[PDB]
């Protein structure tokens, strides 16, 4: 899931750290300057059929932007449905934010 | 070195006013006569600025190696409140380290004795402070002076003169833990000898003297702060409840 | 002479008068540095090079410490270790925690030397906070995040000493010291983008390459700049099929760690107006076509015309490699044509210098010869616009020696003082026999640089015999064993290579014949008089520009970033470009387009692998086989027969020497397609210091932003 | 709130013209001859002060004029004028009050803190601004070199020294009244008896007649 | 917005030249 | 030829033709009772004339000791098999052969152990590409699995270029016993 | 490369990543803190119990006893809750890393393992009620897959395959690693070298691993669970968001990685399936020049012909289960 | 064809660790190196050698390997610096005549 701030801005600033550390090269990021001059991603794809669910992407984030929700129930029909683009990962964060914020609140001291 | 490549890349010498101004007399009166005054390596007379907490502050010229005691209550009317009401003397100006009461009792004012006392004569701008003044506030106003006078050319002074200035305002309030005092000691050792010019030592020496002779004072103010807010502050000035209040607190401070 | 000394035990042999950091490099010892740069003046500000020297109570700054005949240097002693951690702690106390949002991330010297010589954790926790400084508007190309400044002074030293553009400074004092023009100004220097590479940190970044890539994800290719005649050595960093940025690579013989702004920013013009499929002009509209039936309509048109001798004409553009010149030379020859023109005006007539001796048209005292030049006469050349990196090398020698510069031509805005002698040919004859001539006659290693802009002057035949007759009159000074004071300066990367393979018009007779068929081989700067209107025009290139506008066929070739072409720089050095990406769309390698249209016209050029075509180039000129080297000219005295003997009766007209570069930003098709050069011109014209001038970002008059870049 | 970058202003913009008056260039000429002829860039410091004493502060136009007199890039002059504190790059009051707050003044005699307190309450302004009538701009400064005469406050070019809360007020008021009649301008130096720096309770030394050349070595 | 001691006319003298600059005029290296 | 010692590890460097004698001595000596092969593998160094380093790791349960034996091989230069001494070494040499191409003279049944049946190449060679040269799929028209040249929907992104421009480990520290250093000549 | 080790022997995950961490830590020349030493030895024995629950009960499921399998997979189901509390994975934790462990254990886990501990012996005893004295079980493992002590060594056998023929040898006792030198435990060594001995040795290790876990709970020291050096292990999130040096060390560890000094090491541990070792060549850079895994089952399957020769096929299915065989281990 | 060369130091930084070893890499071809994936926009490839590079200690070690494997190879000779003594003292050399430069630290 891709999360926001309380304001509503995306937390992601396109550092690409989660792309460098990916053990399976499952993340593809393309960034540029947004209309307002902010450093933001234009592409954010996660191959759910390449990913090993290690959690490394979320340990490396400096802004808690990428997380792994507790959702394990999302079998799909086609594997095209398993190519998450930035429109799906943001939609996931909007959906799961209370539970994401809660899990972060529990584990942050240990992180 | 400027004796070769100095002003406009020409051979030059820089000498202070008072050193230059005494040359014509020593020529016409003789260097032996000059060497009559002072100790073996501390000859001559010299001009002393006696400022601060004395009854009559002024400037008078006097023979080198005059004892500090002999000087202030004979040429300046005495320290305010009497000798026993002295606390500390900055002997050579802001750059030289502060010198407490019991070291300044039998101290001669020259180059060698002050260097022996882990201090200096500097320009003998003898700043004398009373027993009824905030010593720590006096030294934090100097580390503020040195923050404003740094040229900014080199790293250890342009960054360090501000870092120590921010630390000194904290120790003024007591907003720290006593381990910060040791951290400030070795921050200054990181400054000496690493800078292009001697303005680096100029702000490291005063702090080192204050830690060396007034560490009980600083830890008391921390204790007074640690009493008031409810615990020893984190290193950096944040209060003990900082993590409770949901602030950035790295493990260790 | 050589002093000898020990560093960490080991003896190093370094010349006397050099700095210790130079001997540490020679001894195989890594010394951390931020302020010191090999090509900039010594500054002792960073304090990261502090080493322990025997008989010295303090650590010394190795960068500023001269080497002495017997000193001992410990670079790994406990004195050195605590010195480096203390400096690394100070350099990071006020540094912004902006590594995820910094463009210097992953390629930062502050990060790497913090990992290698610093402490693992930091002790700065002030409630009072860190320093913060406002950003500065210093033109369109450079984005500023000044909180990151570590005060190395590398850019003020570069802009003041190498670029000759003293508008960057350091205002303020102490911790509040700041880098930038006090009053916002647009840094006006064709070398200003070098400040971005010089910055140890990302306080000076490039607005085009704003947040697009991370250094680790870039494929690095060592190639050549073809946007000028100097052949500058570069690194092309690409992520897949898109070139991200172009950086400078070291070559002390050519460009020395520096590239100009055109060669660094014009790469965004490589993805904007590309020819990606064959085009045929049908009923006045360009229709798409396949290769098999665009090469056919080339042949059908050629058969219909049935051209006579020299009626098939070629014009070679300024980005054309030598492989396709040799191939198009052959196919031209098998068609009975020697009509081999060049893009510039006067290029369809024979040139005032010949091509018979290599020394006729080359920069003979090589680019490295300036480092010892004593007097220089510039004729018909604004070198700041025509050869930017070369211009800087002239100033470096001028600033450190008693160098005298005089120019005949149009006055320009120079980064070095120069005497102006005149603008026409008489002002050359009057100069060469005037006061400045005896400077050339007296001063050892004299240097006369003749701009390629006089070759297109009508009086070039008179200009070229004027120069060389002075050279021949003044040998043993101009023409010694190892020196040649005659130098012709190319401004397009294709001219020296065309001259080397003899790709020129041979005689006035072939020049006056009207062609029925013109192959514009990457040619876009042709004069209208050199293409007859009714002719049959084939355009082979990579960018849709003037050439494709008039074509009857358009054939898409490759840009220099996806071919391994051979190019010859103005000094005669034969270099090879490396393809960084592949061909886009249906484009084809340029020499292969020629070789295929040989089948369709029935005269197949023999070679059909590029290895074979390089064997053919070896027959035309063997120097073309020698790579990354200049081959010296042997019969350098034979040059009189073209320059003076065949230029004897010259019809002088007296027209003054003309400027060749109206717009340094808009010189070629890659540049003209570039959005970044669009902003560089517009900012130059209106004098706008704003970084977001035609770019994304919030403004006073754009509260909302803008997604257009370049407009 | 001193800034180290130029803020464009209707009173500080490059388009406003500056030129040294038909009387100043005489001062300029004498200053220039005191340095090597090619090192005239040494004169940048004197002309910036001359420029700001004719205009009021070191304006961007003032600095730019001093650049062309000395054939310098103007950015070389901006770095100087931004480095040295005495140059004012923003308009100031008629009287630029400079109170020293360094340790010796903070302890010397009565502390400087009352002197700042007296200035603040009498001038009705805080640190670094000017008074609404635009006559007094008050800032605090580092040691001014009159430490044995602590506390001291210099105004334009003069040192009103050895100050007390009562004495600093009247020194400031008469200065305000000095805008009309120069007769009421307060005398410089210290108050309360001391001439320059002597002992305040009788001279401890230098009482006998001075010794002349009579005691000189005979060989010379 | 408050008035400042800024020269109004181009030939106005906002601050006096003072003693030091006044004595520079009298300087002459030639002995008298 | 030589021996190295790092911390608790003693390595012996041997000639390829000495394989049978050396391992016999280390198997059947009363002070060298190294009766297990733990592992035999290869490392590839294409900058050497002999590309392949053959590493054997041996265990002595009697003396609670370990020893490493290194030899070298080439694309054409074979190594003696030691399945005459250790039955457990048989499959290990099949792996080294299968993965590197090294050929073991004397081995019974030196066949591939890991790769597919008609596989061409030696994947642990450093010239061999990570994704190989071929891929497989099911062909509906041919009713079988067929073998094709390799295409990748996403090309593999190799982030090696992000290695620090600065060396990060340094030279280390020498830690030889004084019993194995040359005596120094005392002065005078 | 550390997650690759979870997927070698996929029933013994945290001990696969232990041998890779111990190898890298040896080239790093670092000493990991005491708390991570005990965390690793506790979760290495929780792992050993987990593997033996798979190995023993799947072996008896092949032999045709089907009920002990289900009972002990609830015991397996409970012991994977402890994996998912320290990490967030039921199978591939990635928890053990060079320099210690990724995260500190949660604040009520050592109580929950003790509550599991109080009853786990009763689970072994009831599993032992069904197999140990059962004559059908005895008559399907006695004399089956018999290897001599001399041949087990010559065949590269380790672990209970080595130990069931009467060779007393455990890597934990002979080359102690982690907190094993700090714990008291015994080593079951068989007599007749057959499948019945290797079954009885594995059941005894159930009781010995439980005896170690209880000792680890009582000696759990306080302090970092991660090597206290940010050039090697990632800084805390709170430091990275507050201190300059910490964000630099955070950034470079997740992009370039830490450099390992040059050299090679062969490192072995006492894995649940035998001896597991890795040979790592380092080039002084941030990526391994060569990683070679020594898998105990690879050597065991190589000696299957020498051991099953002359036996029946119903005998060979018993020999397959007594050799602890996960084929992701064998093929790497 | 493969290119054997010594990588140039980055313009962006002063570390030279990556310039110390010779690299052998494969040249990009005109087709098959990268194309855009129609579905996700990813970059697809047919070049099996695109991510493979070899490191060698000497130039002749790389040439020996190239000829052993039958590669076509182009060797690029390193570009090296030209030594020149640099002196902090020059920053303050004296000009008898016109300055022609205002050094600004
Ligand atoms: S999700 Fe986090 S790590 Fe990934 S690109 Fe965005 S900011 Fe960087
Ligand atoms: S959890 Fe998946 S997406 Fe995240 S780093 Fe690991 S493999 Fe990549
Ligand atoms: S120590 Fe001297 S040179 Fe260095 S910053 Fe301070 S004042 Fe400047
Ligand atoms: S300049 Fe370097 S250290 Fe500073 S924020 Fe950018 S990447 Fe980090
Ligand atoms: S902007 Fe960059 S190059 Fe210029 S002084 Fe600051 S850190 Fe150095
Ligand atoms: S390298 Fe010598 S001080 Fe920066
Ligand atoms: S302290 Fe105020 S004058 Fe020196």
**Distance of alpha carbon F116 from alpha carbon F127, whole angstroms:** 19
Structure-determination technique? cryo-EM
**Antiparallel, parallel or unpaired: β A27-33 and A39-47:** antiparallel
How many CB atoms are located within 10 Å of the residue B122 CB?
18
The region that residue A53 occupies, defined by phi over 0 for left and psi between -120 and 50 for alpha, beta otherwise, is left
Chains H and C touch (3+ CB pairs under 8 A): yes
Q: Which residues of chain A have a CB within 8 Å of the CB of C144?
A: none
Q: Would you state the torsion angle of the CA atoms of residues C534, C536, C539, C540, taken in this order, to the nearest 10 degrees? A: -160
Q: What is the DSSP letter of C158?
A: I
Atom of ligand 1 nearest to the CA of A2: 1
Q: Which of B147, B152, B154 is the best mutation target for the ligand 3 pocket, counting ligand atoms within 8 Å of the beta carbon and taking the most?
A: B154
- Beta-carbon contacts of G181 under 8 Å, excluding residues fewer than 6 positions away, are none
**Distance of alpha carbon F132 from alpha carbon H48, whole angstroms:** 7
Cβ proximity of C460 and C335 under 8 Å: no
Atom of ligand 1 nearest to the CA of A11: 7
Joined together, the tokens standing for residue F144 give: 């079988």
> By C-alpha distance, which of G160, G150, G155 is closest to G196?
G160
- Nearest Cβ partner of F151 from H15, H44, H52? H44
Backbone angles phi, psi at F48, to 5 degrees: -100, 150
- Beta-carbon contacts of B84 under 8 Å, excluding residues fewer than 6 positions away, are none
Atom of ligand 4 nearest to the CA of C200: 1
Please report the number of interchain residue pairs, chain A to chain F, with beta-carbon separation below 8 angstroms. Answer: 7
Task: Please name the residue whose Cα sits nearest to atom 6 of ligand 5.
Answer: C149
- Beta-carbon contacts of G138 under 8 Å, excluding residues fewer than 6 positions away, are G196
Cβ proximity of C22 and C14 under 8 Å: yes
- Going E25 to E29 to E30 to E32, the CA torsion angle's sign is positive
Cβ proximity of D107 and B141 under 8 Å: no
Residue H56 CB-half CA count within 13 A: 26
Q: Is C381 exposed, middle or buried (0-12, 13-18, 19+ CB in 10 A)?
A: buried
Q: Is C346 exposed, middle or buried (0-12, 13-18, 19+ CB in 10 A)?
A: middle
A109 min Cα distance to partner chain H (Å): 37
- Beta-carbon contacts of A86 under 8 Å, excluding residues fewer than 6 positions away, are A2, A41, A43, A44, A45
Q: Report the Cα–Cα distance between both ends of chain D, in Å, rounded.
A: 60
Q: Which segments within chain B are labelled E, that is strand?
A: 45-52, 58-63, 66-67, 86-90, 99-100, 108-109, 125-130
**Distance of alpha carbon C295 from alpha carbon C298, whole angstroms:** 5
Please report the number of interchain residue pairs, chain B to chain C, with beta-carbon separation below 8 angstroms. Answer: 101
Q: Would you state the torsion angle of the CA atoms of residues G244, G247, G249, G252, taken in this order, to the nearest 10 degrees? A: -130
Q: Exposed e or buried b for every residue in C529-539, given b needs 16+ CB within 10 A?
A: ebbeeebbbbb
Alpha helices in chain G (DSSP H): 3-6, 13-28, 34-63, 67-86, 109-131, 135-141, 149-154, 160-163, 171-174, 195-219, 237-240, 244-255, 296-302, 304-308, 313-322, 327-330
Joined together, the tokens standing for residue H77 give: 């000779």
Q: Which of D103, D110, D150, D160 is the best mutation target for the ligand 7 pocket, counting ligand atoms within 8 Å of the beta carbon and taking the most?
A: D150
**Distance of alpha carbon H38 from alpha carbon H42, whole angstroms:** 8
H or E segment to which residue C670 belongs: helix C669-673
**Known binder of ligand: residue C35?**
no
The region that residue H19 occupies, defined by phi over 0 for left and psi between -120 and 50 for alpha, beta otherwise, is alpha
Cβ proximity of C43 and C157 under 8 Å: yes
Give me the residues of F, 137-166, that contact H with CB < 8 A: 149-158, 160, 163-166
Q: Which segments within D29-158 are labelled E, that is strand?
A: 95-100, 136-141, 153-154
- Beta-carbon contacts of A12 under 8 Å, excluding residues fewer than 6 positions away, are A2, A40, A41, A44, A63, A65, A66
A54 min Cα distance to partner chain F (Å): 19
**Distance of alpha carbon A1 from alpha carbon A55, whole angstroms:** 12
Tell me, using a 6 A CB cutoff, whether residue D143 lines ligand 7.
yes
- Nearest Cβ partner of B5 from H92, H95, H105? H92
Joined together, the tokens standing for residue C29 give: 């010892």
Atom of ligand 3 nearest to the CA of B149: 7
Cβ proximity of C255 and C233 under 8 Å: yes
**Distance of alpha carbon C549 from alpha carbon C286, whole angstroms:** 9
- Beta-carbon contacts of G146 under 8 Å, excluding residues fewer than 6 positions away, are G192, G193, G194, G307
The alpha carbon of C281 and the centre of ligand 5 are apart by a number of angstroms equal to 54
How many CB atoms are located within 10 Å of the residue E4 CB?
18
Q: Which residues of chain F have a CB within 8 Å of the CB of H45?
A: 151-152, 155
Q: Which residue of H has its CA nearest to B153?
A: H105
> By C-alpha distance, which of C432, C436, C433 is closest to C418?
C436
**Chains that contact B by 3+ CB pairs under 8 Å?**
C, D, G, H
Task: Please name the residue whose Cα sits nearest to atom 4 of ligand 5.
Answer: C155
> Are residues D5 and C134, on separate chains, in Cβ contact within 8 Å?
yes
Q: Exposed e or buried b for every residue in C452-476, given b needs 16+ CB within 10 A?
A: bbbbbbbbbbbbbbbbbbbbbebee
- Beta-carbon contacts of C195 under 8 Å, excluding residues fewer than 6 positions away, are C142, C155, C158, C159, C168, C187, C204
**Distance of alpha carbon C635 from alpha carbon F98, whole angstroms:** 62
Strands laid side by side in the C340-342 sheet: C285-288, C279-282, C553-556, C536-541, C517-521, C312-316, C340-342
**Distance of alpha carbon C131 from alpha carbon C147, whole angstroms:** 8
> By C-alpha distance, which of C304, C251, F51 is closest to H61?
F51
DSSP secondary structure letters along C311-350: -EEEEE-TT--HHHHHHHHHHHHTTT---EEESSTTTTS-
DSSP secondary structure letters along C417-464: --EEEESSSHHHHHHHTSHHHHHHHHSSSEEEEEEHHHHTSTTHHHHH
Atom of ligand 1 nearest to the CA of A27: 4
Q: Which residue of E has its CA nearest to D9?
A: E1
**Distance of alpha carbon G106 from alpha carbon H87, whole angstroms:** 61
Chains C and D touch (3+ CB pairs under 8 A): yes
Q: Nearest 5 degrees, angle CA C492-CA C494-CA C496? A: 95
Joined together, the tokens standing for residue G254 give: 């997740």
- Beta-carbon contacts of H50 under 8 Å, excluding residues fewer than 6 positions away, are F155, F156, H26, H28, H33
DSSP secondary structure letters along G52-78: HHHHHHHHHHHHT--HHHHHHHHHHHH
Task: Please name the residue whose Cα sits nearest to atom 2 of ligand 2.
Answer: A51
Cβ proximity of C197 and C247 under 8 Å: yes
Cβ proximity of B206 and B94 under 8 Å: yes
Residue H36 near chain C (CB below 8 Å): yes
Beta bridge partners of H45: F152
Residue B31 CB-half CA count within 13 A: 1
What value does the CA radius of gyration of chain B take, rounded to a whole number of Å?
A: 21
Residue C518 CB-half CA count within 13 A: 30
> By C-alpha distance, which of B91, B92, B56 is closest to B75?
B56
Backbone angles phi, psi at B74, to 5 degrees: -110, -35
The alpha carbon of C421 and the centre of ligand 7 are apart by a number of angstroms equal to 61
Joined together, the tokens standing for residue C311 give: 């009626």
| Chain breaks after residues in chain G, where C lies over 2.5 Å from next N | none
**Known binder of ligand: residue B239?**
no
Joined together, the tokens standing for residue A56 give: 């490394």
Q: What is the DSSP letter of B185?
A: H
Which residues of A are annotated binding-site positions for [4Fe-4S] cluster? 12, 15, 18, 22, 51, 54, 57, 61
Joined together, the tokens standing for residue D154 give: 């210099």
**Distance of alpha carbon C34 from alpha carbon F144, whole angstroms:** 63
Question: Entry resolution in angstroms?
Answer: 2.8
- Nearest Cβ partner of G303 from F35, F88, F160? F88
Which residue do the tokens 């380093």 mark? Answer: F53
- Nearest Cβ partner of D197 from B29, B58, B74? B58
H or E segment to which residue C407 belongs: strand C404-408
Q: Which residue of H has its CA nearest to F131?
A: H48
DSSP secondary structure letters along G126-162: HHHHHHTS-HHHHHHHTTSS---HHHHHHTT--THHH
Residue H89 near chain B (CB below 8 Å): yes
Backbone angles phi, psi at C576, to 5 degrees: -120, 130
Give the Å distances, CA to CA, from C687 to C137, D16, D63, H79. Answer: 12, 19, 21, 39
């Amino acid at each position: 899931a891709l999360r926001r701030y309380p304001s509503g801005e995306e937390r992601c600033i396109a550092c690409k750290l989660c792309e460098a550390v990916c053990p399976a090269q499952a993340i593809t990021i393309e960034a540029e300057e947004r209309a307002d001059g902010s450093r933001r991603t234009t592409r954010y794809d996660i191959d759910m059929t390449k990913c090993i669910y290690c959690g490394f992407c979320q340990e490396s984030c400096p802004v808690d932007a990428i997380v792994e929700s507790p959702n394990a129930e999302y079998a799909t029909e086609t594997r095209e449905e398993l190519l998450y683009n930035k429109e799906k990962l943001l939609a996931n964060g909007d959906k799961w934010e209370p539970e994401l914020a809660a899990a972060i609140r529990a584990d942050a001291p240990y992180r | 070195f400027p004796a070769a490549v100095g002003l406009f890349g020409c051979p030059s010498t820089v000498a202070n006013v008072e050193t230059v101004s005494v040359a014509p007399t020593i020529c016409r009166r003789g260097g032996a006569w000059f060497a009559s005054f002072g100790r073996e390596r501390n000859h001559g007379t010299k001009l002393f600025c006696i400022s601060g907490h004395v009854n009559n502050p002024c400037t008078v010229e006097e023979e080198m190696s005059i004892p500090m005691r002999e000087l202030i209550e004979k040429h300046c009317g005495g320290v305010r409140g009497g000798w026993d009401n002295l606390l500390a003397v900055i002997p050579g100006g802001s750059s030289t380290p502060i010198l407490p009461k019991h070291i300044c009792d039998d101290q001669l004012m020259d180059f060698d004795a002050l260097k022996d006392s882990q201090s200096g004569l500097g320009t003998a701008a003898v700043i004398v402070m009373d027993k009824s003044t905030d010593v720590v506030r006096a030294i934090s106003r100097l580390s503020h002076f040195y923050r404003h006078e740094s040229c900014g050319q080199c790293t250890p002074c342009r960054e360090g003169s501000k870092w120590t200035d921010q630390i000194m305002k904290r120790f003024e309030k007591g907003m720290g833990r006593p381990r910060e005092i040791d951290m400030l000691q070795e921050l200054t050792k990181q400054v000496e000898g690493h800078t292009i010019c001697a303005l680096g030592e100029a702000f490291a020496w005063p702090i080192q003297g204050l830690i060396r002779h007034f560490r009980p004072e600083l830890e008391a103010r921390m204790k007074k702060f640690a009493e008031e807010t409810g615990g020893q502050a984190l290193a950096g000035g944040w209060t003990h409840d900082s993590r409770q209040k949901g602030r950035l607190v790295s493990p260790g401070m | 002479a050589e002093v000898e000394l020990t560093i960490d035990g080991k003896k190093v042999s370094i010349e006397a008068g050099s700095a210790l950091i130079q001997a540490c490099e020679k001894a195989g010892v890594v010394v951390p540095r931020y302020c010191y740069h090999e090509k900039l003046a010594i500054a002792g500000n960073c304090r990261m090079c502090l080493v322990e020297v025997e008989r010295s109570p303090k650590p010394v700054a190795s960068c500023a410490w001269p080497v002495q005949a017997g000193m001992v240097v410990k670079t790994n002693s406990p004195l050195t270790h605590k010195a480096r951690e203390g400096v690394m702690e100070f350099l990071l106390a006020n540094h912004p925690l902006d590594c995820p949002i910094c463009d210097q991330g992953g390629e930062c010297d502050l990060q790497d030397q913090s990992m290698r010589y610093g402490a693992d954790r930091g002790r700065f926790h002030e409630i009072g906070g860190k320093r913060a400084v406002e950003d500065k508007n210093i033109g369109p190309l450079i984005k500023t995040s000044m909180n990151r400044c570590i005060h190395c002074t590398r850019c003020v030293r570069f802009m003041n000493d190498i670029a000759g553009a003293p508008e960057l400074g350091s205002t303020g004092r102490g911790n509040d010291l700041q880098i930038g023009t006090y009053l916002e100004k647009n840094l006006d220097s064709e070398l200003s983008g070098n400040v971005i590479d010089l910055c140890p940190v990302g306080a000076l970044t490039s607005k085009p390459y704003a947040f697009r890539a991370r250094p680790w994800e870039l494929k690095r290719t060592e190639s050549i700049d073809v946007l000028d005649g100097l052949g500058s050595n570069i690194r092309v960093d690409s992520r897949g099929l898109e070139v991200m940025r172009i950086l400078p690579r070291l070559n002390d013989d050519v460009n020395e760690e520096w590239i100009n702004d055109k060669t660094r920013f014009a790469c965004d013009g490589l993805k904007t107006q590309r020819l990606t499929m064959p085009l045929v002009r049908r009923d006045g509209k360009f229709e798409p076509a396949t290769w098999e039936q665009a090469l056919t309509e080339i042949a059908h048109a050629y058969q219909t015309l049935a051209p006579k001798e020299n009626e098939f004409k070629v014009i070679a553009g300024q980005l054309v490699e030598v492989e396709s010149l040799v191939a198009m030379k052959d196919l031209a020859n098998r068609l009975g044509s020697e009509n081999l023109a060049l893009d510039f005006p006067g290029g369809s007539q024979p040139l005032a210098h010949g091509v018979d001796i290599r020394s006729n048209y080359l920069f003979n005292s090589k680019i490295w010869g300036i480092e010892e030049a004593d007097a220089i006469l510039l004729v018909g050349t604004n070198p700041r616009h025509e050869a930017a990196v070369l211009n800087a090398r002239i100033r470096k020698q001028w600033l450190r020696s008693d160098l005298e510069i005089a120019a005949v031509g149009q006055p320009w805005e120079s980064t070095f003082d120069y005497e102006h002698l005149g603008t026409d040919l008489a002002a050359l004859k009057n100069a060469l026999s005037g006061p400045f001539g005896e400077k050339l006659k007296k001063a050892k290693r004299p240097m006369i640089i003749v701009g390629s802009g006089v070759t297109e002057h009508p009086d070039a035949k008179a200009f070229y015999e004027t120069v060389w007759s002075f050279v021949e009159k003044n040998a043993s000074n101009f023409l010694t064993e190892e020196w040649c004071g005659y130098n012709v300066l190319q401004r397009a990367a294709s001219r020296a290579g065309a001259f080397e393979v003899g790709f020129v018009v041979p005689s006035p007779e072939v020049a006056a014949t009207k062609p029925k068929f013109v192959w514009l081989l990457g040619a876009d700067e042709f004069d209208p008089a050199d293409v007859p209107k009714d002719a049959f025009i084939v355009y082979q290139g990579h960018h849709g520009d003037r050439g494709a506008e008039i074509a009857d066929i358009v054939l898409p070739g490759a840009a220099y970033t996806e071919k391994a072409g051979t190019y010859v720089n103005t000094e005669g050095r034969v270099q090879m470009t490396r393809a960084a990406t592949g061909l886009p769309g249906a484009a084809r390698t340029d020499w292969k387009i020629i070789r295929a249209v040989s089948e369709f016209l029935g005269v197949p050029l023999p070679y059909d692998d590029v290895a074979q075509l390089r064997d053919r180039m070896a027959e035309i000129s063997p120097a073309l086989a020698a790579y990354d080297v200049v081959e010296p000219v042997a019969l350098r005295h034979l040059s009189k027969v073209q320059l003076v003997d065949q230029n004897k009766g010259a019809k002088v007209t007296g027209e003054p020497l003309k400027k060749v570069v109206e717009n340094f930003y808009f010189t070629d098709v890659i540049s003209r397609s570039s959005p970044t050069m669009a902003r560089c011109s517009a900012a130059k014209e209106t004098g706008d210091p704003r970084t977001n001038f035609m770019a994304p970002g919030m403004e006073e008059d754009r509260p909302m932003g803008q997604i257009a870049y370049g407009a | 709130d001193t800034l180290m970058v130029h803020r464009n202003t209707p009173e500080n913009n490059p388009d406003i013209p500056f030129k040294f008056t038909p009387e100043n260039e005489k001062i300029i000429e004498q200053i220039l001859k005191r340095y090597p002829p090619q090192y005239k860039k040494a004169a940048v410091m004197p002309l910036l002060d001359l420029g700001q004493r004719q205009h009021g502060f070191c304006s961007i136009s003032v600095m730019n004029e001093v650049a062309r007199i000395l054939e310098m890039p103007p950015m070389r002059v901006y770095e100087v004028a931004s480095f040295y504190t005495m140059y004012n790059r923003t308009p100031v009051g008629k009287f630029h009050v400079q109170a020293c707050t360094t340790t010796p003044c903070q302890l010397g005699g009565c502390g400087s803190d009352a002197i700042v307190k007296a200035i603040k309450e009498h001038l009705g302004i805080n640190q670094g601004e000017t008074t609404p009538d635009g006559l007094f701009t008050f800032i605090e400064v580092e040691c001014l070199g009159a430490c044995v005469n602590a506390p001291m406050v210099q105004i334009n070019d003069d040192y009103y020294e050895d100050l007390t809360p009562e004495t600093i007020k009247q020194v400031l008021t008469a200065l305000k009244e000095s805008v009309n009649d120069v007769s009421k301008a307060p005398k410089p130096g210290p108050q309360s008896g001391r001439q320059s720096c002597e002992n305040s309770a009788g001279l401890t030394s230098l009482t006998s007649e001075p010794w002349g050349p009579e005691k000189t070595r005979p060989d010379l | 917005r408050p008035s400042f001691a800024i020269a109004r006319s181009p030939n106005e003298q906002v601050f006096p030249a003072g003693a030091f600059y006044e004595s520079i005029l009298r300087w002459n290296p030639n002995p008298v | 030829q030589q021996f190295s010692v790092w911390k608790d590890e003693l390595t012996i460097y041997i000639c390829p033709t000495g394989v049978i004698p050396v391992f016999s001595f280390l198997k059947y000596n009363t002070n060298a009772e190294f009766t297990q092969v733990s592992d035999i593998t290869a490392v590839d160094f294409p900058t050497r004339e002999m590309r392949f380093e053959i590493v054997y790791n041996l265990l002595s349960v009697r003396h609670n000791a370990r020893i490493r034996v290194k030899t070298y091989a080439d694309e054409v230069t074979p190594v003696p098999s030691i399945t005459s001494l250790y039955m457990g070494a048989n499959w290990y040499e099949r792996e080294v052969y299968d993965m590197f191409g090294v050929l073991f003279v004397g081995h019974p049944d030196l066949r591939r152990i890991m790769t597919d049946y008609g596989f061409e190449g030696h994947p642990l060679r450093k010239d061999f590409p990570l994704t190989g040269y071929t891929e497989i799929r099911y062909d509906e028209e041919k009713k079988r699995i067929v073998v094709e040249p390799l295409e990748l929907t996403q090309a593999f992104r190799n982030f090696e270029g992000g290695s620090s421009a600065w060396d990060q480990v340094g030279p280390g520290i020498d830690r030889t016993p004084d019993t194995f250093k040359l005596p120094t000549p005392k002065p005078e | 490369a550390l997650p690759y080790f979870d997927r070698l022997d996929y029933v013994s995950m945290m001990t696969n990543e232990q041998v890779f961490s111990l190898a890298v830590e040896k080239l790093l020349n670092i000493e990991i803190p005491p708390r991570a030493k005990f965390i690793r030895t506790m979760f290495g024995e929780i792992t050993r119990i987990l593997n033996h629950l798979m190995s023993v009960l799947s072996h008896a499921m092949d032999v045709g006893a089907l009920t002990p399998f289900l009972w002990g997979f609830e015991e397996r189901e409970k012991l994977m809750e402890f994996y998912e509390r320290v990490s967030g994975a039921r199978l591939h934790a990635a928890y053990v890393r060079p320099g210690g462990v990724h995260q500190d254990i949660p604040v009520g886990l050592l109580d929950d393992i003790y509550q599991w501990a109080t009853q786990f012996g009763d689970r072994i005893d009831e599993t032992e009620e069904m197999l140990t004295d059962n004559r059908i079980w005895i008559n399907r493992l006695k004399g089956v897959g018999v290897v001599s002590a001399a041949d087990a060594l010559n065949l590269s056998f380790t672990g209970v395959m080595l130990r069931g023929s009467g060779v007393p040898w455990d890597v934990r006792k002979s080359s102690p690693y982690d907190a094993y030198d700090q714990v008291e435990f015994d080593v079951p060594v068989g007599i007749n070298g057959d499948c019945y001995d290797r079954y009885l040795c594995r059941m005894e290790e159930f009781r010995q691993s439980l005896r170690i876990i209880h000792q680890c709970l009582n000696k759990m020291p306080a302090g970092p669970v991660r090597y206290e050096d940010y050039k090697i292990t990632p800084p805390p999130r709170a430091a990275m968001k507050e201190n300059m040096e910490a964000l630099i060390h955070h950034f470079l560890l997740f992009t370039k990685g830490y450099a390992v000094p040059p050299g090679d090491t062969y490192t072995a541990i006492e894995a649940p399936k035998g001896e597991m070792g890795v040979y790592v060549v380092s080039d002084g850079s941030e990526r391994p020049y060569r990683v070679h895994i020594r898998a105990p089952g690879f050597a065991h399957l190589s000696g299957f012909d020498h051991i099953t020769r002359g036996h029946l096929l119903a005998d060979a299915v018993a020999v397959i289960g007594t050799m602890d065989l996960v084929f992701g281990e064998v093929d790497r | 064809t493969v290119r054997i060369y010594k990588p140039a130091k980055p313009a962006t930084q002063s570390g030279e660790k990556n310039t110390q070893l010779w690299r052998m890499d494969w040249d990009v071809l005109g087709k098959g190196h990268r194309w855009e994936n129609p579905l996700m926009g990813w970059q697809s490839s047919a070049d099996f050698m695109q991510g493979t590079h070899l490191t060698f200690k000497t130039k002749e070690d790389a040439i020996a390997f190239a000829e052993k494997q039958g590669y076509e190879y182009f060797v690029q000779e390193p570009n090296e610096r030209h030594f020149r003594p640099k002196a902090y003292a020059n920053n303050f050399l004296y000009s008898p005549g016109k300055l022609k430069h205002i050094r600004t630290k």
